[PDB]
């Protein structure tokens, strides 16, 4: 099905490399032409996951940090959709790992909440701010802790993410982990220095916010 009023974007999202190549080579201008969503063939290739296509466009010299209408860079799209090989190609053409979309999110926010382990690594290895805050001042850690993506928390801690940052509801990742009971998560978060003392905009602490059986575990981990 057609995703664009622009032929090339369709060709790209569909995987018609030969055709696409015929066109672009015919009108190099087509590699940068925008559509109804302000997207180029790059955006659509990244979305659909056509690596070969991304690489041809990249080597043609098209821009790698151009945002569509919602503020989505190709790296935003490659990250959110699990295109590991494409994320690699983008970082190798200098894609800005810290670009923010309209919603205040970086590529790492999406890699982190959809559990893109190998892609989170690439981003963080590529200079991604692990403490990047959205519009609610929430970080990847906030997400991982909430959803209890344990392997992801490990990754974010290896890359030096803060554990004691506060969203606009005054909540730290450890708050979130406790609120949703994430035992191993809330343990691990505090074994790396998450405060079991700090209060949200409800003067509540992580312990106050957890279902007894876990608020105790934590206090003894730190106090005993």
Curated annotation (Swiss-Prot):
What stretches of residues are ANK repeats? 1-34, 35-67, 68-100, 101-133, 134-166, 167-199, 200-224
> Which residues, by range, are in coiled-coil regions?
none
- Cellular component per GO? cilium; cytoplasm; cytoskeleton; cytosol; microtubule cytoskeleton; nucleus; proteasome complex
Q: Where does this protein come from, organism-wise?
A: Homo sapiens (Human)
- Spell out the SMART domains in the cross-references: ANK
Query: Which tissues is this chain's protein expressed in?
Result: Tends to be up-regulated in cancer cells with RAS mutations, including lung cancers and adenocarconimas (at protein level).
Protein name as it appears in the record: 26S proteasome non-ATPase regulatory subunit 10
GO-annotated molecular function: RNA polymerase II-specific DNA-binding transcription factor binding; transcription factor binding
What are the boundaries of the region Required for nuclear localization? 1-35
> GO biological process: what's one of them?
proteasome regulatory particle assembly
- Chain residue ranges for the region called Interaction with RELA: 37-224
Ordered alphabetically, the record's keywords are:
ANK repeat, Apoptosis, Chaperone, Cytoplasm, Nucleus, Repeat
Q: What does changing residue 180 to A do?
A: Abolishes interaction with RB1
* InterPro entries linked: Ank_repeat_dom-contain_49 (IPR051637), Ankyrin_rpt (IPR002110), Ankyrin_rpt-contain_sf (IPR036770)
Assembly and oligomerization? Part of transient complex containing PSMD10, PSMC4, PSMC5 and PAAF1 formed during the assembly of the 26S proteasome. Stays associated throughout the assembly of the PA700/19S RC and is released upon association with the 20S core. Interacts with PSMC4. Interacts with RB1. Interacts with CDK4. Interacts with MDM2. Interacts with RELA. Associates with a CDK4:CCND2 serine/threonine kinase complex. Interacts with ARHGDIA and increases the interaction between ARHGDIA and RHOA, hence promotes ARHGDIA inactivation of RHOA and ROCK.
Interaction with RB1 as annotated region, ranges: 1-69, 169-224
- State its location(s): Cytoplasm; Nucleus
Chain's gene name: PSMD10
Query: What is the documented function of this protein?
Result: Acts as a chaperone during the assembly of the 26S proteasome, specifically of the PA700/19S regulatory complex (RC). In the initial step of the base subcomplex assembly is part of an intermediate PSMD10:PSMC4:PSMC5:PAAF1 module which probably assembles with a PSMD5:PSMC2:PSMC1:PSMD2 module. Independently of the proteasome, regulates EGF-induced AKT activation through inhibition of the RHOA/ROCK/PTEN pathway, leading to prolonged AKT activation. Plays an important role in RAS-induced tumorigenesis. Acts as an proto-oncoprotein by being involved in negative regulation of tumor suppressors RB1 and p53/TP53. Overexpression is leading to phosphorylation of RB1 and proteasomal degradation of RB1. Regulates CDK4-mediated phosphorylation of RB1 by competing with CDKN2A for binding with CDK4. Facilitates binding of MDM2 to p53/TP53 and the mono- and polyubiquitination of p53/TP53 by MDM2 suggesting a function in targeting the TP53:MDM2 complex to the 26S proteasome. Involved in p53-independent apoptosis. Involved in regulation of NF-kappa-B by retaining it in the cytoplasm.
